[PDB]
Design a binder for this molecule. Sequence first.
Ligand SMILES: CO[C@@]1(C(=O)Nc2cncc3ccccc23)CCOc2cc(Cl)c(Cl)cc21
Ligand SMILES: CO[C@@]1(C(=O)Nc2cncc3ccccc23)CCOc2cc(Cl)c(Cl)cc21
Ligand SMILES: [Cl-]
Lengths: 305, 305
Amino acid sequence: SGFRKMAFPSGKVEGCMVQVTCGTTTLNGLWLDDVVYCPRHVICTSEDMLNPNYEDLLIRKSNHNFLVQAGNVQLRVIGHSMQNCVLKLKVDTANPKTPKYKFVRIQPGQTFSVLACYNGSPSGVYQCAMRPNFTIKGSFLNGSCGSVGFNIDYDCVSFCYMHHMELPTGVHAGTDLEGNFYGPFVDRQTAQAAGTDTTITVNVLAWLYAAVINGDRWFLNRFTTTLNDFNLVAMKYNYEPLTQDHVDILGPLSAQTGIAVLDMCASLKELLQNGMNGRTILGSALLEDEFTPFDVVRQCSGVTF
Amino acid sequence: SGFRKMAFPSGKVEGCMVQVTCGTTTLNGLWLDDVVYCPRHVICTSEDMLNPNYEDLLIRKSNHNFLVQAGNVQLRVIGHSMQNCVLKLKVDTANPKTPKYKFVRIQPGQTFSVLACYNGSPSGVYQCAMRPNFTIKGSFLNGSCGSVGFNIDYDCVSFCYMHHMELPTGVHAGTDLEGNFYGPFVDRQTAQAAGTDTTITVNVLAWLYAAVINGDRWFLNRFTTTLNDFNLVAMKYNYEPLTQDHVDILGPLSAQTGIAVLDMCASLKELLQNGMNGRTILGSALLEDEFTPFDVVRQCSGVTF
Ligand SMILES: CO[C@@]1(C(=O)Nc2cncc3ccccc23)CCOc2cc(Cl)c(Cl)cc21
Ligand SMILES: CO[C@@]1(C(=O)Nc2cncc3ccccc23)CCOc2cc(Cl)c(Cl)cc21
Ligand SMILES: [Cl-]
């Protein structure tokens, strides 16, 4: 019993974190085999960020301008290249702790673990979701750039996020490990903002199934709805549309609890229209949307890595 | 910016998790140097749990009755002893991944990270607090016994909890690493139930200071309170008494934000009276009590927004 915001064990990722220094800037890098991946904005100065022609700034750098430190050991950079917004520093030592890994790009609504690092040293791990507006509600201070997000499947780490910036509302933006930003953001100093966000409906439903599995059933009712009526109500409350794919993905949770997905939608509609009336669900007074159906199945089944 | 329930990176603890099997029972063990620590109830049947005589059950066991598996390698048990409610299995191999560590017994209100494991394999990591009633609100399924709680301030792991059981309300009970239970709980199937729990006042105040540091002041008021008047009100909401020790511990957060502890107490009194009126504090509609003053200082910026 119990339901916590649970992150993947971070050991396989901790063994990849390094410190990258270029000029006065220090940030984090991800060392996999003989390459260290980091935000390309490490080549930038305070002025350079205003109009950064990253090809022009990079051509002026030599390999020895990049100082890479892994624990108490300096790695030597023997090559450098840029892939989208990530800088790839070729080093003369392959990381002996390189886990089995893949670079994956995730979709909004999908969750991942973040290993927040400072000066190449892991500080903490937390779970978060890629918001529908492509930001993440992270917890990051200055020096956290280059911290990565990941999931684990069996023995393979799927790296899905690298931290680049904090937006004016305090939320965060970054790229996949191929350096493609999530969302309409750029690594240049210009006016940027998080767009209006929405609630991840399929995740709220997954969390309501988690509450039922844990014995919290007060919100259940005899009613069902159709997908179209539910989506008309979801649009009204800034909830993401629920698709037949979401209904299919919630199938196993529906079979386990005996509550059809549209039956749970009628519960969600009533919660949106009437509130919780002084009650909580899984210790929360708000509808939680940062657990996917897979996270719920995994936490209520004890999957290991 | 941001404020998340952040766990310590779990790598140093992952490298210590092993599987312990005795008869048909399989649970987790913590392998540090040449000793594997695990709940002594690994030697019990379900019928033994009503009134187990651990000394009598243990004397009947030989070293080779304990099967210890670390990854795909069987460790050989060369000795065994019981210390309170923990069994210490001496093995013929020292764990090469043993981190710098200490065994620490914590007090109610203290937080720690839990690395939930099954079959000696880590499944996830989350943050927990030792409740005032000495239980933890964990997320644990059958087979999670022997999973540990810890803190990693610096590069030293302070192990503070070993999981033993789930109580009837779905909350959890366990011991320190010397095998002393937290609370009045016993590793015996008795009618023991979690006592009435209370809110960890000093932690709620720390979290209100975190909210001020992150840029929110809506909940502040022009009032102050004496410590005694605050405690008289707080106890009416099932909040723990706030002691002069708690006031002293909140000193640094008070100095950073410019809000006197007793002025923050006045704000908490008003939040208890009024509720949040549709507002949130650090993304929560409830007053959060699982961040200590130390956690807030660790996670938050040293410069108030
Ligand atoms: C060089 O990093 C910057 C940054 O956002 N860093 C941060 C990232 N996370 C948490 C932060 C907490 C507080 C302070 C900065 C944080 C500084 C501000 O200007 C910019 C501008 C751009 Cl386009 C980019 Cl890609 C990065 C940065
Ligand atoms: C042998 O472990 C037990 C247990 O609590 N296990 C569990 C621990 N965590 C989460 C659980 C989730 C669901 C089912 C069991 C869980 C089984 C029940 O009876 C008892 C009774 C006692 Cl006095 C003790 Cl010390 C252990 C156990
Ligand atoms: Cl303590």
